[PDB]
């Protein structure tokens, strides 16, 4: 099979979940400001961005960057590493995690899956409890 | 009161300046290549690293390792002592102190005060980082 999904002009616009999931498996650093990781350029090119969501112990979810045009929250450091920035669309503040058992879920959105983010098809690429984040 | 400052996970991430300074007070060797000293593991754990600065007689200051991602100049050597390496981000050379009255200042940066990622303005400097002076000696006081 092929690692990526291609559109009708053979431009890569997506990938199966397992592929996207595996590409984000190496986290260098996590904190309430965001995630630092190495992401392959060819993976970066198939994504429109990321959705950031806090989930409480009752399973209730809150999307922090909750509009279709607030998905662009990752950028590259001078050294090539990717920072997915929780603060950018959170009033430039770190995430507030009120209980260490709350979860921070980050989802990747592929270009073929791109006002709200509900209804956006997305790929869970990071999920940790507050006590497991910096 | 409490020796350390604790984060939302009840992990120590800082402390009052008096505690940090006191934990670095006793230096085994100071040279232009850096500082050798014993630091308590529990203090090491609350630090992101150190900023090294040369300060002339007129008070003009030069930070040697000036970036948010260059604080990591400390390590444990074979005997468990900490060595704060002045060469690491100094083009791999020892500090050049032009005049023996000039100072070398070293500041510690605690985890709660560290800069994890550059600002949205794209600033990668330590200017403005909150930091704690833990060593300040003139050239003639330095090996």
Swiss-Prot record, chain A:
<comment type="function">
    <text>Mature form that oligomerizes and forms a pore to translocate the enzymatic toxin components edema factor (EF) and lethal factor (LF) into the host cytosol. Following attachment to host cell receptors and cleavage by FURIN, homooligomerizes to form ring-shaped oligomers that are in a pre-pore conformation, and associates with EF and LF. Toxin-leaded complexes are then endocytosed in a clathrin-dependent process, followed by a conformational change of oligomerized PA-63 from the pre-pore to pore state, which is triggered by the low pH in the endosome.</text>
</comment>
<protein>
    <recommendedName>
        <fullName>Protective antigen PA-63</fullName>
    </recommendedName>
</protein>
<feature type="region of interest" description="Domain 4, binding to the receptor">
    <location>
        <begin position="4"/>
        <end position="134"/>
    </location>
</feature>
<comment type="subunit">
    <text>Homooligomer; homooligomerizes to form homoheptamers (PA-63(7)) or homooctamers (PA-63(8)). PA-63(7) or PA-63(8) form ring-shaped oligomers that are in a pre-pore conformation, which do not penetrate the host membrane. PA-63(8) displays an enhanced stability, suggesting that this form circulates in the blood to reach and exert toxicity even in distant tissues. Interacts with lethal factor (LF) and edema factor (EF); can bind LF and EF simultaneously and interaction takes place following homooligomerization on the host cell membrane.</text>
</comment>
<feature type="site" description="Essential for binding to cell receptor">
    <location>
        <position position="91"/>
    </location>
</feature>
């Amino acid at each position: 099979g092929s690692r990526f999904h291609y559109d009708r002009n053979n431009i890569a616009v997506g990938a199966d979940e397992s592929v996207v999931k595996e590409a984000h498996r190496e986290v260098i650093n996590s904190s309430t400001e965001g995630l630092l990781l190495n992401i392959d350029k060819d993976i970066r090119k198939i994504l429109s961005g990321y959705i950031v969501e806090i989930e409480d112990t009752e399973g209730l979810k809150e999307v922090i960057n909750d509009r279709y045009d607030m998905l662009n929250i990752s950028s590259l450091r001078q050294d090539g590493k990717t920072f997915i920035d929780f603060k950018k669309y959170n009033d430039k503040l770190p995430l507030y995690i009120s209980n260490p058992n709350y979860k921070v879920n980050v989802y990747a959105v592929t270009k073929e899956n791109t006002t709200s983010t509900n209804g956006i098809k997305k790929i869970l690429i990071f999920s940790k409890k507050g006590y497991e984040i910096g």
